[PDB]
Design a protein around this ligand. Sequence first.
Ligand SMILES: *C(=O)C[C@@H]1O[C@@H](C)[C@@H](O)[C@@H](O)[C@@H]1O
Ligand SMILES: *C(=O)C[C@@H]1O[C@@H](C)[C@@H](O)[C@@H](O)[C@@H]1O
Ligand SMILES: *C(=O)C[C@@H]1O[C@@H](C)[C@@H](O)[C@@H](O)[C@@H]1O
Ligand SMILES: *Cc1ccccc1C*
Ligand SMILES: *Cc1ccccc1C*
Ligand SMILES: *Cc1ccccc1C*
Ligand SMILES: [Ca+2]
Ligand SMILES: [Ca+2]
Ligand SMILES: [Ca+2]
Ligand SMILES: [Ca+2]
Ligand SMILES: [Ca+2]
Ligand SMILES: [Ca+2]
Ligand SMILES: [Ca+2]
Ligand SMILES: [Ca+2]
Lengths: 11, 11, 11, 114, 114, 114, 114
Amino acid sequence: XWXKXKXKXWX
Amino acid sequence: XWXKXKXKXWX
Amino acid sequence: XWXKXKXKXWX
Amino acid sequence: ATQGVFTLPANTRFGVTAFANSSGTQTVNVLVNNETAATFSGQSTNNAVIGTQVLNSGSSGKVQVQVSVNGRPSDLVSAQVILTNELNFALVGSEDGTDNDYNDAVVVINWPLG
Amino acid sequence: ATQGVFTLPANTRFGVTAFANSSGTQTVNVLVNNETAATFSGQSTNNAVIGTQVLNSGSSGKVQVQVSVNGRPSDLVSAQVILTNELNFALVGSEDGTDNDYNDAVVVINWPLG
Amino acid sequence: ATQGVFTLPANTRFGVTAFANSSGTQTVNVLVNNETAATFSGQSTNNAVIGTQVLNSGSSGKVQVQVSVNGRPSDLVSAQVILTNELNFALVGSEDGTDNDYNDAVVVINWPLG
Amino acid sequence: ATQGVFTLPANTRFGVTAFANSSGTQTVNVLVNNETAATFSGQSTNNAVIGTQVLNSGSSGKVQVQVSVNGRPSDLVSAQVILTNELNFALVGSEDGTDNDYNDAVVVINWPLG
Ligand SMILES: *C(=O)C[C@@H]1O[C@@H](C)[C@@H](O)[C@@H](O)[C@@H]1O
Ligand SMILES: *C(=O)C[C@@H]1O[C@@H](C)[C@@H](O)[C@@H](O)[C@@H]1O
Ligand SMILES: *C(=O)C[C@@H]1O[C@@H](C)[C@@H](O)[C@@H](O)[C@@H]1O
Ligand SMILES: *Cc1ccccc1C*
Ligand SMILES: *Cc1ccccc1C*
Ligand SMILES: *Cc1ccccc1C*
Ligand SMILES: [Ca+2]
Ligand SMILES: [Ca+2]
Ligand SMILES: [Ca+2]
Ligand SMILES: [Ca+2]
Ligand SMILES: [Ca+2]
Ligand SMILES: [Ca+2]
Ligand SMILES: [Ca+2]
Ligand SMILES: [Ca+2]
C-alpha cells in the first residue's frame, strides 16, 4: 500500500 | 492416547 | 515436439 | 506454471488455514473439485489467522487455493512437501503488490488428520 | 539426525502455529536462543489450532520446537522450504504413539511477516 | 522416524542419482519392494556423481534408499517435494561421521520421466 | 513469481546437475552474480545427466538457473528445501512445450560440499 515500513497506513 | 479405538496402537 | 510418439498425444 | 493446485488422496479430510500479512483485506477461496468449499476473509499485518477449516477432498482429490484482494487475483506460489513418507503439507504464498514478499496471504493445507 | 531446529535470519519476526491430531494432550515449546519463548497446549483429533504467536528470532536466529505428551518428548520430523526465494516455512511433525502418522502435533513456522 | 523410504506411484519409471562428499566410499543401495534394484559405490569429496540409473517402482511403489560405508549404516535424512503438482523429488542426505554435514552421500530420486 | 533464483551463502561451493526428459536439446545456463558461470547442453528422454559441475556462489550468493531449447526460454518452477538445518537443495523443473510435465530439464543444486 502506501505509508510506513513495508507499506502500512493507507487503504 | 490410551486404551482401544481409532489410532490407539500400543497405548 | 511435433507429430506422434513424443509424450502423450499432441505436444 | 500453475500454482495453488494440489492432488490429495480422494475422500480424505484435510486442514486448511490462512494467515494475513498485508494492508489489503485478503479473500482466500478453497475449491474442491472445482467448486468453492471454503472462503476466508480478513486483514492483518501481523500474521493473524483469518480462517481455519477441515474439508473433504472428495472423489477427485483436486484442491485449489485462490487469493484475491479487492477482487484482484494475487499471484501465487506453492509446493507440496512430505515428511517421513506420511505427513503432507501443501503450501501457498501470495503477492498482492510489488514487494514480492509473497506472504500477503499464506495458506497451509495439511493431511492426514486425526 | 536432529529435528525441529532451524536457523532463521537474526532479529526477524516469525509466526509459529501448532495444530493437534491426537487423543493425547500436546505441549509445544518454542525455544529462541535456547530459552523458552512460547508454549502451547491442547487436545484435538480434528486439527484444531492449539496456539499461534508472533516471536522474534533474536541475535542468534536459533529456533527450536519441542513437543511432549505427559512429559515424554515426541519423536520429531522437520524440514524448511523456501518459495520464490522469499517465503519461508519451517515445518514440524511429531509422533506420540505407535501409528506413525506424525501429525499428533503439527507446527508451522513462517517468515517474513508484515 | 524412518527416513529414506518413499511411496512412488506404482509401476512408474524414476531416476535415481547419487553424489559423494566424504573421505569414505559410499555404498548406496536402492530397494524396490524390499529387493535391491541398484547399487552405487564411489568416493569423492567434490560432489562427484557416483551413479545414476532409471528404475521401475514396481507393483508396490515402495522405494527405499540405504547408505553405508564399509557395511556401517549412515544416518539418513529425507523428504519428498512436489512442484506445480507434477514434478516429484525424493531427497536423501546421509551422515557417516561426526560433523553432521549430512552430505556424505546425497541421493536424488525424480519422476516422472520422459 | 520469479523462479529459478536462489540466494546461497556467499562464496560457497555448490553442485549443479542437470537431467533431460524431452525430445529437444536442453540448454541450461547457470548465472552467478548475473554472469554466466556454467552452460550445459544435451538431449535425452530418459533422464540422462547432461552436466554436473561445482561452482562458487561468489560475493552476492545469487545463483540463477535459466533453461532454453534452441533459444526459446522454458517456463520454470523451483523451490529450496533444507534438511536437518544443514543440507540444502535448490530444485528446478522446466517446461519446453505444452504437456506440463516440467521435467524437460530438471536441475538440482546442492550444498554444502566436501
Ligand atoms: C500495500 O498494501 C502492500 C501490502 O501491504 C504491506 C503492509 C506489505 O505487507 C506488502 O507486502 C503488501 O503487499
Ligand atoms: C492414542 O490414542 C494415539 C494418538 O491418538 C490417536 C487418536 C491418533 O491420533 C494417533 O495418531 C495418536 O498417536
Ligand atoms: C517436444 O519436444 C515436447 C517435449 O518432448 C516430449 C518427448 C516430452 O518429453 C515433452 O514433455 C517435452 O515437452
Ligand atoms: C494503499 C492500500 C492498501 C490496501 C488496500 C487499498 C489501498 C488503497
Ligand atoms: C497416551 C500416552 C502418552 C505418552 C506416552 C504413551 C502413551 C500411551
Ligand atoms: C514442442 C513445443 C515447443 C513450444 C511450444 C509448443 C510445443 C508443442
Ligand atoms: Ca506483498
Ligand atoms: Ca506482506
Ligand atoms: Ca500418532
Ligand atoms: Ca494422530
Ligand atoms: Ca559428514
Ligand atoms: Ca561430508
Ligand atoms: Ca514437457
Ligand atoms: Ca518431458
